[PDB]
Design a protein around this ligand. Structure first.
Ligand code: NAD
Ligand code: NAD
Ligand code: FPI
Ligand code: FPI
Ligand code: ZN
Ligand code: ZN
Ligand code: ZN
Ligand code: ZN
Lengths: 374, 374
């Protein structure tokens, strides 16, 4: 019906940083060879999308942001073999080309065709499929889900279970998987351990969920916003600490309460100082610290290398270490089988047209994940 | 004979930094409860001893430095049960108290009773057993092997095979063990991998021996002193690179020759910039970088957290990750059984009295390990 033809639809365009999104009419070109056009059904507001606005995460403007979503294939380009019109799908911000050295390596997931390192804001062929006022609008990480319709490369899409509830599983697109994998796959939290989680928003609460699934005996949530404590406790936190309540640095407090330092720490805020602080609070001979938060573009941190020399492990990862195409389907299956919960991360549901209000909820500290419905 | 009495002997004292060592007559107190007095037989000159000289490694002065050595027990204090007079022993700069949370932890080595973090330059009891001109002389990491006799705590000493050649196995006291473990136990080099070793001194060569034993297919040694390449090739390097031959930063060169980044990199020099560079040259998605070198006291480095966020693993270790007391004796046994070689790291042998010439050789870049005999 719309197959093979341009579609005109609503999309929230970010014309310049620091500005509200502009809900306008855009035109979405039909898919080319190995491209897939998807009808968005639900998209979550992740803090990284707000990073495109604030300048924290750099990518070419003007742009259609959004990367945490779920939709239905409207049509496929020639040669696509992994999805079909009608399929429920989850757009993949980190692609899985299956052919590069990282895709072939058993532990890598940062596919070399990503658009994160040298951001082009385009589709794999170097062009855009979006147009607004006669001008080309960039893509965001081969996803751009803040639109009723988007076009993604085949290596940036995964087919999921036809009965999943897309208004929930969209979290697997980013928030939930990132948090969870960080703990279980990257850190590899062990049973009986002591974990410290910095930052209690959506990804942090998912870190907490994974630690709790991993068998952790103590999970310390750290946040400067005490309204975040209750939910953190609800998903697994055994204690919660607000750094503003103490007279000494939080690493001292946490090393004191962990009797010497935690086995696993997680930075899930996106601040150079807490990254350092997170590493330090982990046991000096065998502690592991995972950076999940995105730092302000191009800024460096300062740290004493003796923090590593004594035996500490410092690591980071995009999307909880998950090889995107292969895990997303497994993750939805697991959610279908009640292996984990997504509801705790959803505090607000709004119509896509109220996207600007959804960022206001995020910025004021009132929400965790706001789900936008199309 | 000497048992129970003060021994007068020669020791190389370091009265102040930046000075040559002063061979002087010192008084060695008899061992107290759980202490051991050892007669030194062989001690190697490790770059960290020089760090005490240069101010790079800070510990209380005046001091008897020296920490890579092998001797013979002359007498034991009351309550000692692990070694007896006559045993061949290797002093342990990182103790193994067997009772703290790190000693109990299956992966920690950095025993909480070490004298590395808050240097006191005493024996476990807070007192010194060395006297010179009526003045108390500090110990160095509970070892201080640059003396004909020393007194160590029981948790800082290990009993080894009665027939090992002490003029060779003193290298298991520091150099060899640190290198080799760094590769095989800390980094865990994998068969068929590509490794990059920065620094081709005794430890670095030992890092290369461990990479080659782990099954590495490519081992690139990097040093600004080409005189070091031949020996690095001999123990296993497949290529050698000197950063001064290139007009581009060595991380670029390495990334290019490794077709995108190495699987494991090691900084074995002791510079904040090479630490950063070694991290960068490892593949961004799944590379591992291990800091072995000791950096300038209290100095911080600067690096971009995105090098971690894409997937890299950054870590460090004291003594190749080895639990000191349990591994020293096994390592000597394996050397006894010809599992690994120590001769390649020994380029000079000198009588103890010529300790300042041993340092000269190190500093001029002419030697790897100079072994001092008593
Ligand atoms: N690595 C990945 O693959 C990946 C994926 C998604 C998100 N991220 C990043 O993870 C971070 C978390 O995302 P989110 O969606 O949960 O964000 P969010 O804004 O919902 O959560 C962050 C939380 O940190 C807390 N916080 C802020 N300043 C703090 C301070 N000084 N000390 C302690 N706590 C503080 C806030 O109060 C907030 O609850 C972001 O920076 C985002 O870009 C990374
Ligand atoms: N972590 C531990 O437990 C441990 C144990 C022993 C030694 N160490 C540290 O390891 C380092 C190595 O000790 P070593 O005894 O082998 O020292 P060494 O001095 O024999 O070797 C250092 C090597 O680095 C090379 N080098 C110097 N500057 C360089 C630069 N800018 N770029 C590239 N190469 C450079 C020198 O030419 C030299 O061959 C020291 O810093 C020592 O303190 C750490
Ligand atoms: O939330 C998505 N992202 C984008 C990829 C880098 C980490 C943050
Ligand atoms: O070679 C010995 N050392 C002392 C312990 C810190 C690392 C260097
Ligand atoms: Zn996100
Ligand atoms: Zn790929
Ligand atoms: Zn101990
Ligand atoms: Zn040493």
């Amino acid at each position: 019906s719309t197959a093979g033809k341009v579609i005109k639809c609503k999309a929230a365009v970010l014309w310049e940083e620091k500005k509200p999104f502009s809900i306008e009419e855009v035109e979405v070109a039909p898919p080319k060879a190995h491209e897939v056009r998807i009808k968005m059904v639900a998209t979550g507001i992740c803090r990284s999308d707000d990073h495109v606005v604030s300048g924290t995460l750099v990518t070419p403007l003007p742009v259609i942001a959004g990367h945490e979503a779920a939709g239905i294939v409207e049509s496929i380009g020639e040669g696509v073999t992994t999805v079909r019109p009608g399929d429920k799908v989850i757009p993949l911000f980190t692609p899985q080309c299956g052919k590069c050295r990282v895709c072939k390596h058993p532990e890598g997931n940062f596919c070399l065709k990503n658009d994160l390192s040298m951001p082009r804001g385009t589709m794999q062929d170097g062009t855009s499929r979006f147009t607004c006022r006669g001008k080309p609008i960039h893509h965001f990480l081969g996803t751009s889900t803040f639109s009723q319709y988007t076009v993604v490369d085949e290596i940036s899409v995964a087919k999921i279970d036809a009965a999943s509830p897309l208004e929930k599983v969209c979290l697997i697109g980013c928030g939930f998987s990132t948090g969870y994998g960080s703990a279980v796959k990257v850190a590899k939290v062990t049973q009986g351990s002591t974990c410290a989680v910095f930052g209690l928003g959506g990804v942090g609460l998912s870190v907490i969920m994974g630690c709790k699934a991993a068998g952790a005996a103590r999970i310390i949530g750290v946040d400067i916003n005490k309204d975040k404590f209750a939910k953190a406790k609800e998903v697994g936190a055994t204690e919660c600490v607000n750094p503003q309540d103490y007279k000494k640095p939080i690493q001292e407090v946490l090393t004191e309460m962990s009797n010497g330092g935690v086995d696993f720490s997680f930075e899930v805020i996106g601040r150079l100082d807490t990254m350092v602080t997170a590493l330090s609070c982990c046991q000096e001979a065998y502690g592991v610290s995972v950076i999940v938060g995105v730092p302000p573009d191009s800024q460096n941190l300062s740290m004493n290398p003796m923090l590593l020399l004594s035996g500490r492990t410092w690591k980071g990862a995009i999307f909880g270490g998950f090889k995107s195409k292969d895990s997303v389907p497994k993750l939805v299956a697991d959610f279908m089988a009640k292996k984990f919960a997504l509801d705790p991360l959803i505090t607000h549901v709004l119509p896509f047209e109220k996207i600007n209000e959804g960022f206001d909820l995020l910025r004021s500290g009132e929400s965790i994940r706001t789900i936008l419905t199309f």
